[PDB]
Amino acid sequence: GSHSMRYFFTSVSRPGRGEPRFIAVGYVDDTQFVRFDSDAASQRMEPRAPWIEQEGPEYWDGETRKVKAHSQTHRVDLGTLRGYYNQSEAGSHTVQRMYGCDVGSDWRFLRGYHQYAYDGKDYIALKEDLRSWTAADMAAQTTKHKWEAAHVAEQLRAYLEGTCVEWLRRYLENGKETLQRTDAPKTHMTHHAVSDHEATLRCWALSFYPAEITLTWQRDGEDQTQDTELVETRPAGDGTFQKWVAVVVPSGQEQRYTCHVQHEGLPKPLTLRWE
């Protein structure tokens, strides 16, 4: 019953003409609820979950103002970092930032995050205590010194431990119907004969939420990872997730193999067998 709020920002410079492409998205747990895309016509923060549409015009005005200001900061940063790294004005570069908070089952502050990347590599991040900085190279160190002088960490801390948690709690209440509902995976097994000697058993988990899940195989009650293939968890497109794990087995020995499913929506883990 623990939860998270996270915002993700990507800015990509367009050296030939104009301002960077800027995309911002907000999530509660695994549910996107807001977006901004600099390429879109509205130039507004837009809703992406029914429960945020409950918020009034003042909310949308404030979030639009803020997200536009965020876009300007990253635009400036793209130029600054180009300078720090002594790069030409010719190439496209990328900055990425993620920030937000985790709460426990009590819906009180557990952890905060504020991290930043340049061209896909760690640049600077707040440490877990939210009081000091991890800078990856001497360019990031220039930013660290600046942010230390300006007491940036203290301003960020206050949001992460306060405002972030307060609004997460509001969203969790307002979106109770979905955000506080767990969708247990719908499970089944399939079988395919590859040869006279070999068969594949595939254990499916569908339509689950949240995305976190564990799928494992056992042979005669012992963990089996050899001759298995596990795909990365993928979105169904309706807010839920999918995953499968497969095992290659001697034809005729299917009964030895059991699939094991762990998910927050299941009281006890599930055990499946080929019938």
Binding site: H70, T73, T80, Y99, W147, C164, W167
Partner: peptide, 9 residues
């Protein structure tokens, strides 16, 4: 809700 402000790097 987003942060009120972000300082430049």
């Amino acid at each position: 809700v987003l942060r009120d402000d972000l300082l430049e790097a």
